[PDB]
């Protein structure tokens, strides 16, 4: 099977190769941003798109190029043609609105509450947790790796098991 693009979240000129799994917020937190200190007037850059994937919560969003999208045979490529058209007719044509939008997008990566846990645990003893995301409805809850959730949202785990 293949991945499917749900929504184009953002666009940037970023460091060549700063795409894929190393760009999730949790890979950035563990190993540093692959795009850190990028200055488009000092080194090779490429147009990168921030992708929200179908069936994966916002913590799994990754930066991708049209090349990486085509190489991984992702579905929803019609949205790329659509986003590129929309992006071009914005540059031709706000900063408080883009800032507000960005803060919102950051909230979708925050666990508000844990509402279920798996009976099975990993070898490291972590169950998976069903997460309610800040600023998103319950229809957007998702199962997540307990080891990943414990890194930043231990307080949500503690609240869930305190009940």
């Amino acid at each position: 099977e293949f991945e499917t693009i749900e929504r184009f979240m953002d666009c940037r000129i970023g460091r060549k190769g700063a795409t894929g799994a190393t760009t999730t917020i949790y890979a950035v937190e563990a190993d540093g941003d692959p795009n850190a200190g990028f200055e488009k007037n000092k080194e090779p850059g490429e147009i990168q798109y921030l992708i929200k994937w179908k069936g994966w919560s916002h913590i799994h969003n990754t930066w991708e190029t049209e090349e990486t999208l085509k190489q991984q045979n992702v579905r929803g490529m019609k949205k790329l043609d659509n986003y590129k058209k929309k992006d071009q007719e914005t540059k031709r044509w706000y900063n408080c609105q883009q800032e507000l939008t960005d803060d919102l997008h950051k909230q979708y990566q925050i666990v508000e509450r844990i509402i279920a846990h798996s009976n099975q645990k990993s070898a490291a003893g972590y169950p998976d947790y069903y997460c309610k995301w800040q600023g998103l409805p319950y229809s957007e809850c998702s199962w997540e790796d307990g080891a990943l959730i414990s890194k930043k949202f231990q307080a949500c785990i503690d609240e869930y098991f305190s009940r």
Binding site: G20, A21, T22, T24, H60, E144, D145, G146, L148
Partner: peptide, 7 residues
Amino acid sequence: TSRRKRA
């Protein structure tokens, strides 16, 4: 039923 993004 969780997953992580892996290279």
